[PDB]
Every structure is written in C-alpha cells, then in structure tokens.
Amino acid sequence: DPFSNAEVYYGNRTRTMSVFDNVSPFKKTGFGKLQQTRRGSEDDTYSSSQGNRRFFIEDVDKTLNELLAAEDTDKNYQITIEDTGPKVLKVGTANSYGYKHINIRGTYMLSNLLQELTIAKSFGRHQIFLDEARINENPVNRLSRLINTQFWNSLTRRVDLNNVGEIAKDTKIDTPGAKNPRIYVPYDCPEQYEFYVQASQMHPSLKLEVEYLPKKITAEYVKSVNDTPGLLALAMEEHFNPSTGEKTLIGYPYAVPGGRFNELYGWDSYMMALGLLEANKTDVARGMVEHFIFEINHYGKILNANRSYYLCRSQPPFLTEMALVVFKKLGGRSNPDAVDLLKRAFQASIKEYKTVWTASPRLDPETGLSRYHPNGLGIPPETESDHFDTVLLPFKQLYNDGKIKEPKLDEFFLHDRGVRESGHDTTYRFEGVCAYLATIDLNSLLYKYEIDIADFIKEFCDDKYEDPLDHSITTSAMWKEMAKIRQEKITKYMWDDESGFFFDYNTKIKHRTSYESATTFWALWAGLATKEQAQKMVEKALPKLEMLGGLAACTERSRGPISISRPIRQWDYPFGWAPHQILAWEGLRSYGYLTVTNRLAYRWLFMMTKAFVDYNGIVVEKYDVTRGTDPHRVEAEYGNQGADFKGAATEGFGWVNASYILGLKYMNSHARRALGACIPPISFFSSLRPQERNLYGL
Amino acid sequence: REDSVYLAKLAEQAERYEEMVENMKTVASSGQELSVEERNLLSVAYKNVIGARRASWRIVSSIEQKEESKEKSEHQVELICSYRSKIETELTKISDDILSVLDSHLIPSATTGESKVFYYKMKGDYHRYLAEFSSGDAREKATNASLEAYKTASEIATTELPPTHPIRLGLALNFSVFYYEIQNSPDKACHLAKQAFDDAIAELDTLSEESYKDSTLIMQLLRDNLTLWTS
Amino acid sequence: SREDSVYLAKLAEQAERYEEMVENMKTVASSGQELSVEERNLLSVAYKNVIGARRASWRIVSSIEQKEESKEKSEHQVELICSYRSKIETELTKISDDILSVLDSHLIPSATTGESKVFYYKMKGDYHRYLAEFSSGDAREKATNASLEAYKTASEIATTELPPTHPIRLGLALNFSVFYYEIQNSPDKACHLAKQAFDDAIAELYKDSTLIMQLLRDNLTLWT
C-alpha cells in the first residue's frame, strides 16, 4: 500500500546489509560541478504512471541534503516554483538496489519527495524503499488524503491528567499572575476541580493553579481576573484503569482551528464538524457539541475561546445546525444516545437564544433585531501590550479601576469587543460601529435557530416545550411565527431591492448601511430570503463579490481607499475566507442555484490546489481571491503563518481544511480531473461544450 | 515469440535493457502487429538503452568543455574527446537499429491510427537523438528526417486520435521540444505546446483512469516547459 | 600510460560506464607500482558496480522464479527464468574470477601497508562470498572456505594493526558477520562478531565510522 498512514508506511538485502562502497571519493567534486539538465520530453511518463516503480533510498539524510542543496535556492526548507534549481534529481531504483537510477522531474514531485524524506526522517528511518505513487500522487487526491487522515488528528485535542498543564499554558498576557498555567472550574463541578488538582500534584513543575469560579460570573469579576488568566474547564467523561479500576476523568475530544492553538473556538467548530463528519471522525464533532452544551450551562454562552478573558464574549451561533448534522451522522432517531444528545443541545440552544442573543444588551428593543454587543468592562487584557496605545492620551490602571470614567473610550472598547464576537476581526464594515449594527450575519443565524427550534419542539417535545428557567410553554407554531416576524423585519430594515444586497442596519442612528458584504448570502443559508430576493442577489450582488478564487469578504467599493492611515484589514476585499464560501455554497444550493455553487467551488478549489501544488503543499488561514500566482500570500494585519514549516506542512487550518473537502463534494469527474491537472477557471469554463456550460451557471 | 515477450518482461524486471531490446527486436521483426503492451515494451527497451548513452554523452561533453578552457590541456582533451567519440558511435548504432525496424517492419505494417502515430513519433524521437550530437551533413539529414516524421505523426494524430489522448499529447510535447531544442524555433515550440495543452482540457472525462494519469503527467511537462520558454 | 588509464577510469565513473572503468583500473593494478588509496578506491568501486547490478538482477530473477514455481502447470516459464538466471550466474562468475585473479597475482602480494592488507583480503573474502551466494556443490564449498580464510586473515591483521574505529576494520566485521549469517548460516558467530566489533568500537574513540556502526547495530537488531 503506497498511500497508507505515514505511521504505518515508515514504521534479503531489503533487510541484511553489507558495506556500501559504490561511489569513489572523486565522483562528486573531482570534475567540478556537473548538474544534469532536466529533459522536457515525454521520456518515461508511461512508466511513471503505470509501471509501479519503486525507489531505494540508501541514505535518507544524504539524499535530503542533496535535494535541498540543488533545489532549495532560497533556503526556506521548501521546494516551490520560486526556487531556481534544475528541477531534476536521480534516485536509485528498488530492483537494482540503488545501482541504477531514474529521474524525478519538476517542482511538484520533487517537493513531494522532500516531504516523504522529511517524514521518514521524523520516524527515525535512515534508509527506505519508496513508491513513486506516493510522490507523483494527483494533488487533489493528496490534499484530500492528508486533510482526512493526518490534519484532523493533528488538530485534535483531548484533556487528560498528563496534558492539562500544557494545554492551559498561555502567553498572551505578561503579568506576574500569568506566569503559571491556571484552570478555572465552574463552582458546581467538584469532580472536575479534584481532577485538575490531582493533575497539578502529579506535575508539580508546571505550578498549575486550580480555582473555583464564583456562583455568578459578572463583567466585574471577569475584569478582576485580568491579571490571573486561566483556561476554562470543558466537558469530561469517566475513564477507568484496566488493572485496578481507578476512576479518572478524560475530556471529550475537540478540534482547534490551527496547530498553534489549544483552545476550543466558537464558529470554527461547526465548519470543522462538517469536515470531521466527512472524515468519519464523528467523535471529535460530537465532542464539540458536548463542550458547547457545557459552556452554555456553566458560562452562559458559547465562548469565543475557552479562556477566562473571553467569559463575556461569544461568536456567531451555529449550535442547532451543528447538533442536527451530528445527530444524523450518529444514526438519528434510531440511536438513543443521539436522541438524548440532540435534546440536550437544543435545550442549550434555546437557553442561548433567550438569554444571550435575544436578551439585553444584544437585543435592540426598538427593532427587535440583535447586535454583537457583549458586556465587559475596561481594556481587553489579552492583546499586545501596546495595541491600544495610539488610542490613549491622558493611566491604564486608573481607567480599568473605574477611577477615571470616559464614555468615548467605553464606546471604543465596546465596538472592539463586538468586532471580535462577530468573528470578522477586523473589517471596515465594523470598525467603530459594530456594536450598533443589526447585521444580516447574526439575524440570519437567529432565523436558523428559530426554524430549527420549532422543528425540534414539534418532533421531540410533543409540540409543547416548557422553559426550565421561566416555565413558559411554547409550540412549533409560536417559533415559526417568531421566524416569520424576523424574516419580515430583516427585509424591512436591510433588504435593498436595487443592489440585491441585505445591508446591516445601524440601530443607534436608525439607518441602513451600504457596505456590500459576502454575508449577504447567509440569508440564503438560513432560508429567510424569498425566491425573488435570492434571484436579485445572484443577478446583482454576486457579480460584485465573485473574484478569480471565489467570494471576496466584501466589495472593493465598500472597503474604500487604502493608505498608511487606513491599512488593509483581513475580513475585507481582496481576501476570501472559508466560512463565507461554505455558507454561500449551501445557501445557493437551497434556492436552486447549485449550478452557481459549482462554479464558485471550482474557483475556490482551483486556488487552494494551485497553492498546494506550486508551494510545497501549503494550506493557509485565508486566501487572496484576486491573486493569480501566490494567492496564499496574505500580509493583512498579522498575515498568514501557514507557510512557516520545514519540509512538510502538518495541519492546515480547520475550516479551510473543511472547505476543500466540502467543495469537492460538488465537483463531478470532469471537474475533479481538471482541478487535478491544474486547469484555471478561465480555461476550464471556456473548454466546456455549450451544453455543459450550463452546469456552472454560464 | 510469446517466449520473447515473456523474456522481455523479465529483463525489464532485472533492469537489463539491452536484453530487453533483443527480445523485443525479434518480436517486432516477425510479421504480426504489436499490441498496445508490446509496442510500449519495445519503446521502453530502446529508450532505456539509448538513454544511458545520452546521459553519458552529456556528462562527458560538459567535462570536455570545462577541460578545453584550461591552458595547456591538449592531452586531457584528446582523451576526453576520444572517449566521447566511442559513446557517439553506440548512439548512432542504437538509433539506426530502431530506425531500421521502424522503416522496414513497423511503419509499413501499422494498420490502426494509434500504432501509426506511435511509430512516426518514435521515428521523430530517434532522428532527434541523432541530431543532438551529429556533425555536419548527418545533423542536417537527421534534423530534416525528424521534422518530417513528427509532421506525418501530427497529420494522422489530428484525424484519428481525440485531443486528450496520451499518444497525441506526448507527440506534441516531443514535437515542441524538437522545435525548441533542435530547430531553435521558440515561437513554433511555445504555440504547439500551448495549443496541445488547451485542446486536452475539454475531454478529460472521456479517458480511462489510467489514461488520465498518463495525460496528467504529460500536461505537467507541457506546463513546466511553457514556464521555461516564457523565461 | 598509467596516468591516462587512471584518468579514463575517473571519466568512466562520471559516465557510469563501469565495465570500461574496470578495464582501465584492471590494467593499472596489473602493472608495477602499488596502488594509492585513491587508485585502490577507483578499482574497488569499478568492480562493486559491475558485480552489484548483476547481483541485484540475480535476486529479483530468483524471487520471480520462486513465485512461478508454485503456480500450477508452469514448467515452461520455470525453464525460461532458470535459463535466464544461469546467464547472470555466468557473468557473476566471470567478474568475480576476474577480480580474484587480480587480487591473487598482484594486489595481495604487493601490499606493504597493513591497512591495504586488510582491504585486499576483505575484498577477496567479499568476492568469494558473492560466488558462494549462488554456487552449488563443491564450487560452493570452495568459495565458502576461501571466503572464510580471507576474512579470518583480514581480521587478524586488522585486530593487531587498525583501531576498532577504522572504517576498513568495521567494514570487514560487517561483511564477515554477513558471511556468517548468510553463507555459513551460523547466526551465533554473526551476532558475536558484529556485537564485539561494535562494542570494541563504542568502547573507544568520522561519518564513515559511524555509518558502518549503524549498519552493525541494524543487522544485529534484525537478527535478534
């Protein structure tokens, strides 16, 4: 098996060895430098695709160093199209035990060879047999394999007694009280408290601190632990020792958005669950539903991330869809564990709707729509030490201590917290105004909650749900009616028939915005648009957002002019993000525009594949959907770091990983084959027979 | 004959390619047309045999050029030059061998369009190999014979093979290399490779899984050559 | 001239034309002077490449023969493979006899340095071993015995004249333990010799020494 997991793949003369003395000391440098030129003829292409050729790598480290010496000219431990080497390397054949060789040609197969050798070295191998099929692998098959079989595992976390201290460790706050790792525990979780204490005493070098949270978690308290930050406890289950039966606790698993993260995040987790279900890693997706229930129960809300300085802040809500898709994958009504899970998730969803999203201060009483408007006092402590200094002329201590009050600062920081909770940190759609906007984003997602909560009440609560908090009774018809109210309020305040956009509506000054955003497509995803509204959005909104690589986060017109005073922001034109693609693909599908999704997915899939092929298998946080050569280069705000790896990239990025697997589901065989051969959209579309042009809405 | 085939498959496994040539040679001499598998066995045999001399010729040529730039180097150069001369002799003999099998047996008896394109392309290949190193009139006879063989292959490939066929794409790739490297015509080379790449896009779905993988790698070489030729 | 023959041997290695590399170095070794260490490596590399590709073809041909033996009603393919293998065995015999005869007539007798003594006898033990890999009957017995004697004689000089970190001595122990494991089928002596030569090397003081010790530990692991 040439495509087994590297753990397997790298875990007579093929065994017993004698001295290798096949090369004289004069051979490499006796005549100076003598590099062969790559041949561009067809040559051995037929043997490469059909021969089942295998290599003998006698010395993994020697071959690695040769390949980097010849092919990595910028010395970044990567073989990319910007390297200026000869693009050919001889490797010994397996059947001749290295005494004869063939040529590996081209940036892509040489980069794969670099990767395979680097990975073999990581497993301690210093001599290997290597299938050519593992280095001439079709790039679409290769990235899918790596996402499904290697990236999710590396993105997976699971708290146990031996890693709590490391997972809790945090570096964003440089106070004395943040030197040690710390874990905060809900006041009514004493089994979990004792577990983390036990974890501390077993690893005393970490100096892990364990603290009970108060019975009631206020904005005042969260500010009070700015200098003593901690990880937050998540859901756990009981585990037993095989020999003794001693009980310990082990956390449900979860996925992080990127390898440098140890925290469970908010809206990433739903997009990741979608990719995880495709990879049959259902336990990880279910684990995060468990944690989101735990957070809602014990912290009042789904958290941006599970640390204390986030206790007042949420993120865009997807719990009812997340619960539904996991429920189905687990077997639906036929599985009583899945039925119980769905009930606990929808109970938690109903609490979240009522006491976070449609409660003050997020609820706009006049319009009834909601704003990203979190509570919380003072200056956010987790940012860089000087991040807010340009907005500080008089001090920090006296402002947080409430000694000196300043309502223009309070509005500044309120918008800052709201920008983070919106997920879109940062964009000129939200700078200085976010907490006053009733976005199409959030209220589309609440429409989804209402429709989904209505179906759940009808089918699992005998059409009569009783709030455990206020003991009210609600029916599916009541929730369908709240959705209808919402659907008509959104159209009233947000729908712009002339542009075909839904615009965020500002609730303080009581006027609609004109910022053109890709989140307009969330009205399709959530199902609230009408046929006529969807049709004008496809006709007039989509041409303003559909770029080479997919949907820009906003139009170039709305973002406005960029200068030194007004730098680029990462959730604006020309950048494209995986959540905007995924929600838009399914939204358009819902309304009969699958043919449009196909085109948009081909654009996004080509852009990710091109970067994968040409740049050493990289996967990146977000893309430039207008950039043709290196769309993975994004220098906005803090820029992409997915390029900082040596030899082989290890994880990618959660929802970007998921977006590639999900997008491929739309591609038929002709389109998969054209992506595999690196055919740009302009050439793929223009090659279609006029009948097949219709499959991509052209 | 069925024996000679089996013994060619064995020699390939042993990577003893001059024996692979012998077995495939007597098979191509007997009157019967070759299957797909048999003509690929013949091509792999001869290409591996000439390929070793081509690589040797090129590394010895570079050594020779390096040496003739040194002062007072006439003695080393004539050793190098005479060693290169022995490699050129085998190059022409291997080429003439396959070229005679093509001219007298395989090109006359070819009845399908595939086989006809396959063999005219091989013929263009080996005249091209002769043009790479031959002096004076022999270079010109090989240069012209190579063009004429690729031309004939292209005419037949245009009417008998779909634009995505591995054999057609491979023909355009090798023909484009001839234009660039032998005739020194970067405009003809660039456009031929570009037209061939593009024309293969529309019908990628009609190919078997194994043919799609052959055409993918061929198109990779077309792309990468285009990158080089547009500096 | 002798200098031209060395130059043409280096040029033939660049061309990976090893049969020709053998001809040039065979004439250098058969005429007069003792070989320098560089000329001794050129000779050794020339034959190891010529014999090495033949040995690899031989192992794959034999592996295929073994599969086709256990197929039903296959006598005709089995005759074909066996006949093909015999052609390779003939080449193996001609090549090994060629270098052995050069070792016996010229290289071993003219060896003054003790290091080149261990080199040439280890080489003789190697090529008798390659014969014993495929030979049968009394020709196998004769190759085994002459291989053991060359290795034993090489070990005595190296044990008393080369540091246990020297590559030529470590290399000798590696190949000699292989002779024990593969030819004489004495896994105990293979293990013991390999262990001891690793130990007496790890018991004291270059990349080339550590590579061979690596191969000694690898075989040792496998054999256990």
Ligand SMILES: OC[C@H]1O[C@@](CO)(O[C@H]2O[C@H](CO)[C@@H](O)[C@H](O)[C@H]2O)[C@@H](O)[C@@H]1O
């Ligand atoms: O007042 C209940 C309210 O408080 C929160 C967060 O502060 O949860 C706290 O109270 C719960 C009920 O006693 C405890 O289970 C929980 O551990 C504690 O943090 C919210 O989750 C809840 O809505």
Ligand SMILES: OC[C@H]1O[C@@](CO)(O[C@H]2O[C@H](CO)[C@@H](O)[C@H](O)[C@H]2O)[C@@H](O)[C@@H]1O
């Ligand atoms: O990479 C984490 C870091 O990025 C920020 C802002 O740059 O948030 C972005 O990354 C998150 C991926 O987990 C997204 O959830 C969020 O929507 C996105 O803007 C920071 O907020 C975060 O600390």
Ligand SMILES: OC[C@H]1O[C@@](CO)(O[C@H]2O[C@H](CO)[C@@H](O)[C@H](O)[C@H]2O)[C@@H](O)[C@@H]1O
């Ligand atoms: O129209 C596509 C799709 O949208 C749904 C809801 O998902 O209904 C929407 O469209 C109708 C307008 O044409 C409205 O009547 C309805 O209110 C609106 O939600 C589905 O019914 C339909 O499949």
Ligand SMILES: [Ca+2]
């Ligand atoms: Ca590089």
